Design an enzyme around this catalytic site. Structure first.
Site, short mmCIF file in Angstrom:
data_model
loop_
_atom_site.label_atom_id
_atom_site.label_comp_id
_atom_site.label_asym_id
_atom_site.label_seq_id
_atom_site.Cartn_x
_atom_site.Cartn_y
_atom_site.Cartn_z
N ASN C 166 38.61 -60.84 -18.17
CA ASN C 166 39.63 -60.00 -18.84
C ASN C 166 39.04 -58.82 -19.57
O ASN C 166 39.71 -57.79 -19.78
CB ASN C 166 40.59 -60.86 -19.65
N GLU C 263 33.59 -70.10 -26.41
CA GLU C 263 34.71 -69.27 -26.87
C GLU C 263 35.85 -69.58 -25.88
O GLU C 263 35.77 -69.19 -24.72
CB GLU C 263 34.38 -67.79 -26.90
N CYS C 297 42.66 -63.91 -24.97
CA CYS C 297 42.41 -65.17 -25.60
C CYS C 297 43.07 -65.38 -26.97
O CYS C 297 43.62 -66.48 -27.13
CB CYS C 297 40.90 -65.47 -25.74
N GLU C 477 30.65 -64.36 -32.35
CA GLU C 477 30.25 -63.08 -31.82
C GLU C 477 30.65 -61.95 -32.79
O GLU C 477 31.59 -62.18 -33.54
CB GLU C 477 31.06 -62.75 -30.54
#
Lengths: 503, 503, 503, 503
Positions: C166, C263, C297, C477
């Site tokens: 994505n 993640e 997400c 991150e």
């Protein structure tokens, strides 16, 4: 110490202090020389508690030499070894909490309701810095070509603290705690109006296990304070007090290039918007002005209230101020005691008189008061005061008063109030009452001060730093930042190969 | 700027400077008034490059006002927005590195070999603080009973720097970089002997995209420097210079309770034990005394050498010092140029004459010198000097000389040398050469100074902090610690429910 | 690279990709073996751009070996030397920003309006970790009885990153930037649906100066991803994707005790209280559900709206969703392109049909769509969907859909909504719209998720950490915390005297 | 608790344990079901102390539910409130130090000389993390365009610890202390060989004032351990033990995406160079192999000795190992007790027998031993063993033995030893003996392990972190880093204005 243990049977007007108040080498020093002494008073009654005997050059030098020899030992103890001793000191103040708080009240004049919080803050600050002591460290960094550096976080040496009279035991603790955790020795000088509870703190650190002479106490006024600033073997001075004296301290300290921190007064602004919760804003303004007889550095003494809610704010705030019980500070239900001295009371009354001459409106109080209770008749009492009709050019709106005098002023807009709030050389604290999330953080960001309270006032958490902006001083107390004002970094650079040389 | 672009065809004795050197509001200011000017010299030749026209009260205030309006804009840019501009500045200095270095040699007198390292240090320091800009932050802390606090790291305002003449461009940059990354505006004052490369730095920040007026330059001597210290709208002063002048700065700065950082001189010790690698110690002592004609604050000018290896240390160190090539600094193989001015040369020569009167032994140099090349005949040259037979009470062992004069002294034990090395009021830097791992770290821990070099001397990493102990000053440059001297924490306490009130 | 340079004249339906997409040893690898390839599509048109050729065991091992040799070199460069290279990489991506964004759109399908932000995020993240590199460090701590300890902050080795489709270029950069700043080497694996822009990033780091083989790309699906998880010389895997695959990654990584960060997706709740500013909440819900075709997400896909304002919220949110322009992503006014693949479109459309079968109400969209423009006829298009009449037990309210499908649900109280928002095993993000200051912070504190937005949605600052709670994964991150997942501390204890022994 | 108070009159061979050893809801649970029990032994004598009754699914769920209800309360207390309770728990262990140490000896077998250090470490670790609790915090960061973000440092939830039998009380404390400071609740499972002192710790937290059910104890073996790993309401598992079991824990933990930290064994290398101080290196090697009967995870069990000094190293090391007094652990002069169990003793003896078959030379010990004292006849005793003539491919050089067996090997160069030291999949600890400063730091830097000791071995400071590299695990214990494995950051982004929207 025997005086401390006798506190449960003590009461206002009953105590006399007979101990020697100078303390170094782990013991109270018998005064001599016949130095001109000064009276020390009980604010609720006007009685003389004892005479203070001030220290001259010889005395200060002995204090500093004692501190240096303990420093040679304590600075060789690791974080975890200093911590253990500091935790025992906290434990002992906890056990003696109520007795210490009572004696505190007797000398200083504040209520036991408040004094119990002060003494709790004192032991919590010691336990907090104990907790940080094993955490103290420098860095390790890898450099180009195999070399590496490391920084060692080291102590300073002998640190001198010059204290104020409004929070005697608590401020002694707030300068001892970070200094000790960082491996320094300390020499401090109580305000000469409040000399007695300070030597209890110093005795308790000795009881807890500090190398003899680590924490020392020299009594005296300006001259005694000047000797500390000029002493060649003091590494750092920390001062709490007025702007003019703070300026002088910095200047005297310039002669030996000393480390300096200054916590000076304020003229802090409290901003109350129309969307606030009114009863919380009333509580905030009352807590911003009247703790400790209004003798508090951070007090929000300029209360700016948005025009539309001014009438209802004023109505409730005046009723609440008049309801404050002024009397014997040893009673649990008293809410204001006597101010610290006669000259202070007179100066505070002088400000209110001067304000009415400049056009201020007295909505309540601002006069001498004699309580019903006969043993309080000569105490330093006044009625808490709320002023109206005030202007930005008035003397009472510009100067730190340091008594219970709230100045209230209207405003129309956020841009307007923010310029009037910041138009000053002071910058200790401030506050804002409002319910909008953006407005609350925006106003806090635009206010030029060391602290900003949002929807409250006068909280003092040990977990976060505290100190001034602009002419309210520099340096911090409490939180993690404060360790950097009582320790210094040494940079060690290690060449792992051969030397790069032009010669 | 056109002068900088003309450097590739310039050479010693050819340049004249015709630009205006005062700079604020993003532009060079045409001098006027007919203020008494001062000559600015080329050290290698004695020629006059231009006259410096010092600023008075009116000029300083214009400079500060220009700094204030740019500060309003820059302090509203986030860390990542300031970073991007600072990174373009460092890119532009990189591209013009060799031209800038050349002009730096012509005014200051050091070799281009050294100057190239200076200029690289300047752009690396700006890139390093750019990188820290987006990292800048305060804390979030959870407090008893649902309240929480947060600290905001904020800029100070207009910071003033007062600089020295021994590393002109690099020291400008070391004060601009941390100041700008933290969100401040800057006004700096070059030494009046080296005014010209300073305004190139200030023009390059503007080229890179700084809000107009963010970096300003005012030329002058002590009076100009005093106006900055006294200006009511300057929030901080950072000074580099002598002990006596730093004392006065700190005093003048006390009138407005200013933030102060001081980087003063030194009399740093270099300890050479018998187990060292001799050639690396020889390189160390040479690099500790003769860079930039001996005009360096950290220089290890008291070289303590363990008695057994003294003869062989001295043999090699005198041969290497006499081999140093002294002459035109613009040649790649020159290793020492002329000292900065005639009065400095004379004072430095006065110290060597005074030392021989007190007993000292000249092993080499210590005299006026006239290079072969005829254009260099009136330059301020001397031969680099090594002294022997020295004592701890001698003038040359106690005082900072600030010329190329090594004093060498024997020692027998570690406990002995450590006391003689620390018996001073200076505490900038130090060094140790030894191979034993405990000895190295133990000596570095016991040496009272901001920096210790282990098995090397004169490294200056941007990655780690640098500053004095004791009378060599306080505050840091370089490293992550320095951000705390160019920013300040605001504590914001948020009450999540109703206010706790006694009233 | 020649393809990237040809982008200015490219358009939807015009491109074919002819480069080799495997990359190690600093060069593109010519496919062979005739391994079964897989088609890679242009989402706007349905065209085949090229075939992807997946890596087997031999290929992955070559990639890792190349990574290991460059790691030996790069881990010996200091932070300030790594930084300089990483800054040049960011400079190159900046210069080629528009061309890279365009190619990103062609393979992934999102609009150029969003792609330009993705590519800017990619270079800013590389510039942010560059800035952190010279800051990296451990501690120096003084221990009881003269010993001391130091920690060294070291790299891990070869890090593997398994990426999603994505945000292809941006997510490659988010794993490369922190891994590289901390001194590691990298092998990553693009989604096999989006393999092309990833190798541009790897070529740019080589242009910028990285030791050959430092950043490597292996293409493939589950098998290629499993080889990386199983490889004995990979020190760490970082995965981004679905819950069920992340579980398997963790399990395969357990065989070699590898460092893992995950993640995973979400079902993030957005809470809209009746006191919000309705238009900002409308924007928030739209920005929480329809960026990148709903394939994000963190999307707040359960929109909880306080019963009183539900009607007006719905009216405006449906009109704004129907107004979204769906068509060619290379136009600046398009706001939704095609979803990534046909099977993904079908699964998303299967959810909306299943929701209507369970009782949901479609207020708009939820159907296949054929744009006017003929070249888009076979693209993977649908109309953005808003669902009503939803329940907590419905399949569409519990499962991550990963298409443009907003589920909207009423609520009555704060305590109620908080329990229904937290009653899930997911915990990636969440949001709250309200004006009351306590309510905002209190709701953010009580929501169980890694991120909460207050009065906005979908911001992604590089300055702050990002990652999951509970079954949405662990590790972070961006921000400063992320450096601890790409480096490890080594504790070094140094005894300064003799050993303490029981034997 | 009554057992603990009866310790001053207890002795080896006298005790029987009659308490219930399962503990949740603040009380000891009466076993039932008649689940198959297992014997628990006294290592010095072979006696049965009691039977351990393992927990099944129902029991583990009860323990976790109790933990969850306490967590709801303790996670709402601030750092300063959790601290006060933790400090009282440390005080209570301090007061009962000698009694707890004795009971620890009786079950585990190690000497009281060592046990006293274990029990002191346990209270110091609780006191260290108490001190950190009020320091815990996130960040505040200013973002572009007036927005700002903050991170909250939050607890995880119910943390599970699975412990080893070599340091029973200490390791329960090392996992409880950081978990509790960070606001979590805890369920731990002792080794089934050492179940009894763990429930004393859990009772002392309750005495100190922890919310009922905060610290729970479930006894059992692999199946009980698996139930914790699989439990859906456990947020994190922390494991100490072997590599093979650690791998399985990670795998089982993947099913609910749990947080995992693993502290696995090692085969740590100790490097002795020819310039060392030999007596300090002999002490080092002895302290690296023979504490707690050789049953220590960091032991330097591969001793690399530079060829030239091998003969004299071996001479002194053998004589010192033979002199170790093996017998009753409750005597102050005993230096080695019985190993933990019969199967362990047999496996350890199996390794020595196998080593002699592969070619190894037994220089001392390595055999069953029956002390003179008759009550020790059935104890699990052996003589401490030194092996010679060893090779890198031998089973005894590659595998963790976990008994008192030192393997000694010769080496010629630094580059050689470093490759043989790092040629393993283990990486817990290591050490080096040498006098050269560069060699010490360079060897530490090149050794691939979580810890390196310079000129000592086996120090365990609470102040610094501890854990493995490679297959010796990940995560830390002790120091400040460990807080990040017991808390998680939530990023909160606050929009101060209107929402930026594409829709």
């Amino acid at each position: 110490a025997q005086l401390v243990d006798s506190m449960p049977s003590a009461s206002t007007g009953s105590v006399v202090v007979t101990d020697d108040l100078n303390y170094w080498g782990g013991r109270r020093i018998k005064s001599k020389d016949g130095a001109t002494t000064e009276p020390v008073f009980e604010p609720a009654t006007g009685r003389v508690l004892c005479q203070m005997v001030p220290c001259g050059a010889e005395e200060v030098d002995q204090a500093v030499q004692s501190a240096q020899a303990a420093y040679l030992k304590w600075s060789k103890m690791a974080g975890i070894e200093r911590s253990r001793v500091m935790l025992e000191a906290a434990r002992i103040i906890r056990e003696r909490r109520d007795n210490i708080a009572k004696l505190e009240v007797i000398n200083n004049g504040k209520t036991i309701t408040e004094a119990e919080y002060d003494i709790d803050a004192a032991w919590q600050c010691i336990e907090y810095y104990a907790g940080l002591a094993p955490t103290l460290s420098g860095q390790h960094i890898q450099l180009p070509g195999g070399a590496f550096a490391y920084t060692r976080r080291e102590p300073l040496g002998v640190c001198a603290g010059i204290l104020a009279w409004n929070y005697p035991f608590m401020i002694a603790a707030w300068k001892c705690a970070p200094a000790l955790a960082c491996g320094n020795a300390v020499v401090f000088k109580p305000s000469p109006m409040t000399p007695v509870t300070g030597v209890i703190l110093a005795e308790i650190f000795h009881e807890a296990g500090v190398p003899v002479g680590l924490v020392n106490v020299v009594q005296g006024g300006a001259e005694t304070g000047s000797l500390l600033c000029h002493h060649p073997n003091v590494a750092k001075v920390s001062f709490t007090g007025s702007v003019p004296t703070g300026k002088k301290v910095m200047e005297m300290s310039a002669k030996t290039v000393k480390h300096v921190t200054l916590e000076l007064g304020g003229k802090s602004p409290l901003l109350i918007f129309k969307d606030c919760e009114l009863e919380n804003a009333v509580r905030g303004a009352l807590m911003a002005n009247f703790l400790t007889q209004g003798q508090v550095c951070t007090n929000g003494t300029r209360v700016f209230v948005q025009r539309e809610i001014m009438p209802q704010f004023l109505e409730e705030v005046v009723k609440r101020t008049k309801a404050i019980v002024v009397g014997d500070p040893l009673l649990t239900e008293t809410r204001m005691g006597g101010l610290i001295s006669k000259p202070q009371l007179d100066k505070v009354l002088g400000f209110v008189a001067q304000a009415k001459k400049e056009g201020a409106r007295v909505l309540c109080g601002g006069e001498p008061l004699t309580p019903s209770d006969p043993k309080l008749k000569n105490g330093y009492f006044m009625s808490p005061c709320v002023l109206d009709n005030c202007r930005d050019d008035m003397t009472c709106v510009k100067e730190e008063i340091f008594g219970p005098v709230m100045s209230v002023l209207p405003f129309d807009t956020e841009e307007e109030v923010l310029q009037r709030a910041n138009n000053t050389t002071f910058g200790l604290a401030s506050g804002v009452f409002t319910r909008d999330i953006s407005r609350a953080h925006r106003v806090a960001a635009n206010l030029e001060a060391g602290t900003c309270y949002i929807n409250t006032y006068s909280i003092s958490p040990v977990e976060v730093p505290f100190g001034g902006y602009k002419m309210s001083g520099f340096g911090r107390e409490n939180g993690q930042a404060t360790v950097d004002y009582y320790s210094q970094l040494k940079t060690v650079i290690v060449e792992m190969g051969d030397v790069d040389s032009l010669f």
